[PDB]
Structure formats: structure tokens, C-alpha cells
Amino acid sequence: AKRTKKVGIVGKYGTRYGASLRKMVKKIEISQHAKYTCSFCGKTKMKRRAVGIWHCGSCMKTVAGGAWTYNTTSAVTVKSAIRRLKELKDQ
Amino acid sequence: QVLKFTLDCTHPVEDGIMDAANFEQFLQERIKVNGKAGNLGGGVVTIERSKSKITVTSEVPFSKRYLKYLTKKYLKKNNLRDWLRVVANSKESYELRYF
Amino acid sequence: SSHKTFRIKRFLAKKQKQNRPIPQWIRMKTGNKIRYNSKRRHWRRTKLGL
Amino acid sequence: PRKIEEIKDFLLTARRKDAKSVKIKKNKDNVKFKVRCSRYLYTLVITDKEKAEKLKQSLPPGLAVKELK
Amino acid sequence: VQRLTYRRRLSYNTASNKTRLSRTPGNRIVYLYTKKVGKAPKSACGVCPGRLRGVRAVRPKVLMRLSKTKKHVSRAYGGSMCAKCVRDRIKRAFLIEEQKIVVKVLKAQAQSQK
RNA sequence: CGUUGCCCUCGGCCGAUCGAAAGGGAGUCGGGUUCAGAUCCCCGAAUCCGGAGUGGCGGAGAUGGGCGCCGCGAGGCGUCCAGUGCGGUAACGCGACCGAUCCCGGAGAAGCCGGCGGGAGCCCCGGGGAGAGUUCUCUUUUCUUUGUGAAGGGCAGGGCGCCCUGGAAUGGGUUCGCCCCGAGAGAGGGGCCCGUGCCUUGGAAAGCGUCGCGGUUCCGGCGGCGUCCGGUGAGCUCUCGCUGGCCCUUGAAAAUCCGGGGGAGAGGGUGUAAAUCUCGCGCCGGGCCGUACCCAUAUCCGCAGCAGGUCUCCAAGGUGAACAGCCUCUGGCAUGUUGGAACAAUGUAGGUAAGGGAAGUCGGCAAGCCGGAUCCGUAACUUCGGGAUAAGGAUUGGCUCUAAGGGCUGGGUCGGUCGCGGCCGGCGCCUAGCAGCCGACUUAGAACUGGUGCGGACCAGGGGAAUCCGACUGUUUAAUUAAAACA
RNA sequence: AGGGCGAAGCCAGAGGAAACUCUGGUGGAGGUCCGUAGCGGUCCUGACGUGCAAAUCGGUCGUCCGACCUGGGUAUAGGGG
Ligand SMILES: [Mg+2]
Ligand SMILES: [Mg+2]
Ligand SMILES: [Mg+2]
Ligand SMILES: [Mg+2]
Ligand SMILES: [Mg+2]
Ligand SMILES: [Mg+2]
Ligand SMILES: [Mg+2]
Ligand SMILES: [Mg+2]
Ligand SMILES: [Mg+2]
Ligand SMILES: [Mg+2]
Ligand SMILES: [Mg+2]
Ligand SMILES: [Mg+2]
Ligand SMILES: [Mg+2]
Ligand SMILES: [Mg+2]
Ligand SMILES: [Mg+2]
Ligand SMILES: [Mg+2]
Ligand SMILES: [Mg+2]
Ligand SMILES: [Mg+2]
Ligand SMILES: [Mg+2]
Ligand SMILES: [Mg+2]
Ligand SMILES: [Mg+2]
Ligand SMILES: [Mg+2]
Ligand SMILES: [Zn+2]
């Protein structure tokens, strides 16, 4: 809290849009601009390019992910289920 | 180096309009060196007399067209800048002429 | 305009030829009712079939 | 245009069918030899004066040799 | 100061109407119109973002004029594809075929066993 | 050998066609020339595209190696094979280097915004010249002017997400910001791209500046001299480049052009061939239409030479934050459809007013106050971001000084030997650096000074306390309603 | 144009046993503020009102990186757009 007590990323917006909305945006607004780790090389370069598409700059691995996160929870839970059923079918 | 600039005034003197000795004297007075008017900055520049032709002979850096200025100043003092005109005859030289 | 089609240029040319005033020998013809051209078009007032 | 470096090479270029005017510019300290062709204007810089005077004679059948002034 | 005008009837400053200042032998600043900037070809691999070496990056309708050597490079996949992606293609294509052979061998042993 | 007829063989497309004088789209520039046209005429330098058959010529393909003889030897013949180019560890290179249908790829082909860097044009400064103006006094003066097209070749200067060596924690490298590294950092060596910058061919012959002649004339006449050297930068304009930021916005197609994978074919048989996405040269051609001028306080539209409207490019000095205003050069005008003489009332547009200070009026409408900068100082309230230039204060000129901020280059001196310079060996090793040489510009402080004047013109917020409405930015009745209406 | 405010990220220093927090920088966000060109059109209920003008003029104003301004091309036509 060097410059701001409690706005951070959403200090750009100034007074506008209301407190709740700006608090609500701060979560996403952070995550979406986060640089994640490319589970492919392991550098911290997974960066959202456009909605649902994240690109490693080093790996050059474009990756269909979430709108504001490299992974949605939904996607993750769906992944594991499919893996479980796959194993249940084939044996 | 040896910077040798003539300043010949042949046919204003032959018509008897000005005197070259007085012009030499005026040039020995004025010609400034390093921002000092009198004494030619010591034994630095040297002014010669040959009836009509003046020669200025410097050792230090010395502009040519400073002689044009001072002739123009001298010609104004004598009320000659009207029918007398300074021109570069050749390089290292000026030349007083009529119109 | 300085970017003309050929169609338009030719159109203008004829218009430019039509402007000239009557030849005075016409006045001396036998059954002459014509004194002046009366179809004269000045560019500054009256502005073409366009 | 094209500069040339061998006195022989310019002589060969001058000897072509397509060539014509072989004008010669005494610049002082240089003496060029400009020989026009179909496509290009070949020039050759010959720093020596006596060597240029010698070459002057070595152009062949009755070309223009239109010396420049 | 010498201001200046465009030399063509295109008034608007556009991709087509780009210029540069030049002093002539006549000692007048004049506009010369400038040729667009050509790009080197990018790789056929499609991952390597960097454009290819040893090729004259020039406007494509020029290539026509150019000599073959300018337009490519002496290698397999020359001036189409970056080296790195060739020497990975090579050893990939080799190593793959060695495993295909190993699976063929394991298949043939299984037939002889059964 | 062409040309055609027939037979077989192969062939996806994708919609005929139209649609851009600003999108895409090969290739032209310098000088001259007109009463009026010039990238179009003339001179000179280029260039693309198409053709080029019989192939016009060189060069490449390609002229090896073997064995057998004969010859002192250089070599000559006989006979056997090879020959769709070579160099580099590599990035990749070299003037050419066969090849079809088919396939893959690229280029054409990409938003806006920020920051930083390089290159030019212009400005600036210090000087050289040539011509000027000033000269009562002063002024080595102030003013002008001081050049090199495209296309080639060279070389700086940029950039590289290219390669090789090698192996980095005491982690390093490094940007204004970042950002990069065992998926290979630093360090060394290279490779490629752009090269609009220099040099050079062009090209001094041409241009410009000066002095000077030839000619009653006509005359694009002819000569001299010159066209120099340096330095600066959050400078501005354009541009090339790198690197970020923004998006529930992700920012054109196609014609055209190339590369690669393939390997169906073709070539001649030991001096030559087919082959040149041909290398260098040579020859021939490029039709059609537009091209005057105005482009706007007089060539356009508003009935007109109408204070209206109407898309762009270029863009000097001073002051200054500044493309603000004010004054200036370059260039341009004659005060906007008239003149003269008066200076009454009413006006229109400006100003100023003693004492009071909104008593005026529906209402502070109108005008006035405030205004820049630096330094202090800053409330309630709050969605904690704001409010905020809150409010409220002080300073500001001229002059003469001081201090503080940067770059470049230099020691390998002693001894030897070789030609002030090199090479070797030994000291030295400024390793707290010191010395000389350059150059923008700011900031702070101090003295003195003036009739307290100083952001001296220009530019340039009046504040405060509360209530009502609508969250906000946005939009709206062209021509009486900008709002609380719509969004 | 030119200025103001100075959001994330980044650096250092200081404290903290940790969690992390302070101080100074850097950085340059935004339907952010001032303010030019541009776009507009509040008030003077000013000028004009047989006008310059069948809606103009002057000052004063709003906005000026965004639901921004704007040329050309192209689409929608009358109980229709
Ligand atoms: Mg009209
Ligand atoms: Mg175009
Ligand atoms: Mg190459
Ligand atoms: Mg068409
Ligand atoms: Mg390295
Ligand atoms: Mg014209
Ligand atoms: Mg104009
Ligand atoms: Mg008047
Ligand atoms: Mg008048
Ligand atoms: Mg008028
Ligand atoms: Mg009063
Ligand atoms: Mg009353
Ligand atoms: Mg009252
Ligand atoms: Mg008021
Ligand atoms: Mg307040
Ligand atoms: Mg209430
Ligand atoms: Mg509102
Ligand atoms: Mg209205
Ligand atoms: Mg209104
Ligand atoms: Mg009114
Ligand atoms: Mg009236
Ligand atoms: Mg009038
Ligand atoms: Zn690759």
C-alpha cells in the first residue's frame, strides 16, 4: 500500500463506476494482466493475448484457456472427470 | 603561416582623390588584434606602402574582409563611398574602383 | 475538374464552340430577323447541362 | 553509369559495336574517359596525365573522341 | 525556409503518397516519392517469429527482377524455412521412423509368439 | 519446325460481370525551355515490362581422372569411365547453376497509444570566403549567399527472437521503463537485413554567387575567380527501428510476385548437348483517355465578386510551456462594392470614473475581481480514488557575482633492438585517479540597484456555505427549448 | 499543440522475529483535468433584424484519445426509411 490504500489496479478508473463495480473489477483486472507460468517450458510468460487465448512468448504455445484466467475451475473439473471416465471405459 | 593581403588603390590615387600615406596611417591606427586597436597587437601584423598598393602581412590568423570593412570605414570618413567601390580583384587582394 | 472523362471533354468542346457570336454578314442576308446570338452562355452565370 | 578500373577494360568497352562518343574530361588531377554505350556510360579515371595522353592515341577506328571543354 | 509541394495530383498523405526530402544539384529541396518497405519472408514452420536470413527483403513484385541467389539460401528448405526448424524436422522425421520400425519389430515378435 | 484437324491423357473450385483519380498495384530522375505546357517539350543520365524465332554475342553447364602407347621433356594419339556448379564447423556465401502436373509456404497483408534510439530537412552557434547595408560616435559589423537527382559500387550507422566456442549462485547481464539466462547468461569470435547517411561513378561539362568582357542589334554569347571548415541539441518536421500498454474492440480482400517439397521427364556421348526462376552484355516495342487555370473574404455551392459553407500537403526568427497571443523575414496584399468635409443628438464597439458598494434588477444580467510561475499552506465531506489551482499566504524586474550539475583524449615512461613509428622484455600500473581539450543548458544562493516597479504588453480560474435534479463521460429539437429530457 | 494530476508494475533504503509496513525514486494508467486546431453552440435574451446571411457576426462559452472529428464509396424510400 505504497501509493494507494485500497484501489491498486482499479485506481485508473478514478471515482467512476461505483465502489462495488470497481472492487469487482479488481479481481479480474489483476488476473487477466497476470503473467502465468508456461507449463511447456516453465518460464513465467503465459500472457493473455485476447479473451480465452493465452500465449507463451518463449514457448510460442498459444493456449485456449479462460476469459480472465489461464484456467477456469470448470475446465479443470471437466478435465479430471473426462480422464476418470476414459480410464473407466478402456480399463 | 604568412597571411599576405594586398589592398591596391591604383586609380583613385592617380586621379588624386585620396592619399595612400594617410590610409596606411589610418590602418596602422585601427586594425585591431585580439581586441586591442593600437600598436598592431605588438609586432604581429605589418603594413606596407608602395605608392598605390597597400599590403598587410600577418603571422596570426587574420581575416581578409576585415580590410574591406576598414577601407569602407575609411572611405566613408573621407566621403568617398559614393564614387569609390571596393572589390576583390583576386584572392589575397581588394581593389578600389569607380562605378 | 482536371480529371475529365473523354465523354465529358467532348461535350465541353461543343459547348465551347457554340458560344461564339453571330457573323455580321448574316445580318445582311435577305430575310434576316436575327440581330444577336441570344444563346450565349457565360461561365460565371448559368452552369451547363451538368 | 559505371566506373572502370583497368585501362584494358575501357579499351575493350570502347571497341564494341554499340559504342560511340568517347569524350575526355581533363579535370586537372584526374583526366576521365567517358565512353557512352547503348545501356551505360562507362567512365575511367586515369590519374596520370602522360598516361592519359598515351591512351588518347590508342582509341581505334575513328570514334568521336569528342574532347570536352 | 523553402517550403514545398507534392509532385503528383495525390494531395492526401497516404500509404501511397510517402516522400522524402532531397537536395538536387540545382540547389533546391525537392520531394522524391519513396518506395514501400519490403519484408523478408517469415518461416514455413510458423512458430519462429523471426523473419528469414539471406533473403533480400523487397516488395514482392520485385522478386521477379532479382537473381535466384538473393531470393533463397543454399539448404534443403532454403529461404522457405528457418534452419532450426529444418534440423528439428530432420531429426524428428528420423527419430519417428526409428520408433515406427521398433513398433514394427515388436508387432512381428508378437505374431511369431502367438 | 511451325500451324491446325481428329483420337487418347489430365484438370476441383466457386462464379459471368461491375465496384476505389485517398485501399492494393512493376517501372523516372537532374538541368534547361514558354506570353500560357512541362517528372509529359530539349539536353543528359536512368529504368521496368513484353518480345528476341533462325537464337545477336560472350560466360556458366565443362571440359577432369584413368589406363595404354609414342616423345629427352612440354606434350601427341588409342582406348576406358566420371561430369544437371562450388565454398564454409555453422549462421550462411559465391555471377549463372535442368526440370512438368502436384503439393506447402511466404510476400501483397494490417488497430490505436506510449517511451526510447538512429537517419535526414529546417533552426542554432563558431569561424573561412563573395557581394551588402551601417559608419555623427561605436561596431574584425550586421544582412544575403555559400550545391549535387535517380540507378549502381564501396563504406559508416542502425537492427537481429542467427551461428560457433563455452559453461554462469558470491548469481550475472542490462533498459529512461524493462527485459534475458542450463530451453545456454556474461566473454570472445563470426553470419544476415536495412543502409533514405557519407565517398564515388553520375559530375562540373551542368546549377548557383560574384567580378569581367563580346554584341547599335540578333544573341540562351563567352571568360575569370568561388562554391570552405568545424560544433551543437527533451530543438521542431518526416522517417527507419526497438520496445512496452489497451481491448467482452484483436484492427480488409483480391489481382499480382516469389521461395521451398517433390522428382514425371529432357540432354550429349568425351567435345559437345539439352539447360540457364541467366550472369554479363546486344536488338525491337509500349497503344488508348486525362494533363490549361481557379481551388476561395472574386473562377465551386448558397439567385450575386454574399462576413455562410466546402477534403488535404508544405510550414522560417523573437518572446514563451506552447502550432497561445504579440512583433518580425521569405512570399503576399491594398483594408474587403467608393471618396471628400465636419465631429451634433440618438446609437454599435471600446475605455475611465470621487464617496458608497448590489441600496439596481424577476434575478449580480452586464462588467469587475481572480489569473502565469516558484515557495509555503490546504477544510468539510468521501465510493479512500478524490475534493484540490480547495481556501489562505509570500515572492517575481534590472544589474554584478557564486555554487551545483557533462563529454572527449592522454601513462604500457626503463632497457633492447627494428624502421617521430613499430616489435620484444622488464618495471609502472593514476586501479582514491590526475592532466589537457571541448560543449549545451538549467536550478539554487548572494551583493548592489530603481519614485515598491517587476507574470509591467501579450497570455491568464473570482472564491466560499448550502439545498433540488440527474451518478458520471456521451446524446438531443439544422432555424426560439441543452435540460432535470434520451443514452 | 503545450501543460496538470500521477493508477498498476519496478528499484533502493529503513523497520519488522514473521506478516508485511513505511520513506525516497522510477513508471506513465485514464470514455482523467486545464487548453490549442478540430468539433460544437451556453449567456449577453449583445450585433444584425427590407441583414453579409431565407439563421449570419462579436465576445463569452462546452468539448478536445473517445460512445472523438472528418473526405470518398456503399446500404436503407414515403404509412416507407
Ligand atoms: Mg457560381
Ligand atoms: Mg492508390
Ligand atoms: Mg543468399
Ligand atoms: Mg473493376
Ligand atoms: Mg553472450
Ligand atoms: Mg496543372
Ligand atoms: Mg491557397
Ligand atoms: Mg477600415
Ligand atoms: Mg479603399
Ligand atoms: Mg470584397
Ligand atoms: Mg465609482
Ligand atoms: Mg428596488
Ligand atoms: Mg434588492
Ligand atoms: Mg456574467
Ligand atoms: Mg469545494
Ligand atoms: Mg432533503
Ligand atoms: Mg447528466
Ligand atoms: Mg434548436
Ligand atoms: Mg440554444
Ligand atoms: Mg438578440
Ligand atoms: Mg434597423
Ligand atoms: Mg460588406
Ligand atoms: Zn523455426
General description of the model:
This is part of a larger assembly, with chains A (91 residues), B (99 residues), C (50 residues), D (69 residues) and E (114 residues). By secondary structure, chain B is of the alpha+beta class. Chain B has helices spanning 10-13, 20-30, 66-77; strands spanning 3-6, 46-50, 53-58, 85-87, 95-97. Chain B has three helices and five strands. In chain B, the strands form two sheets. A three-stranded antiparallel beta sheet of chain B has the order 1-3-2, covered by helices on one side. A two-stranded antiparallel sheet of chain B has the order 4-5. The longest helix of chain B is centred in the last third of the chain and has 12 residues, at 66-77. The N and C termini of chain B lie far apart (36 Å). Chain D has helices spanning 7-14, 49-57; strands at 2-4, 22-23, 34-36, 41-44. A four-stranded mixed beta sheet of chain D has the order 1-4-3-2, covered by helices on one side. Bound molecules: magnesium ion (22 copies) and zinc ion. Residues 54, 69, 73 of chain E line the site of one magnesium ion. The PDB classes it as protein transport. Keywords: Protein translocon of the endoplasmic reticulum, protein transport. Cryo-EM Structure of the Mammalian Oligosaccharyltransferase Bound to Sec61 and the Non-programmed 80S Ribosome.
Annotate the secondary structure layout.
This is part of a larger assembly, with chains A (about 90 residues), B (about 100 residues), C (about 50 residues), D (about 70 residues) and E (about 110 residues).
Chain B: E1 3-6, H1 10-13, H2 20-30, E2 46-50, E3 53-58, H3 66-77, E4 85-87, E5 95-97
Antiparallel strand pairs in B: 1-3, 2-3, 4-5
Chain C: H1 6-18
Chain E: E1 19-23, E2 29-33, H1 60-63, H2 68-71, H3 83-113
The structure holds two RNA strands.
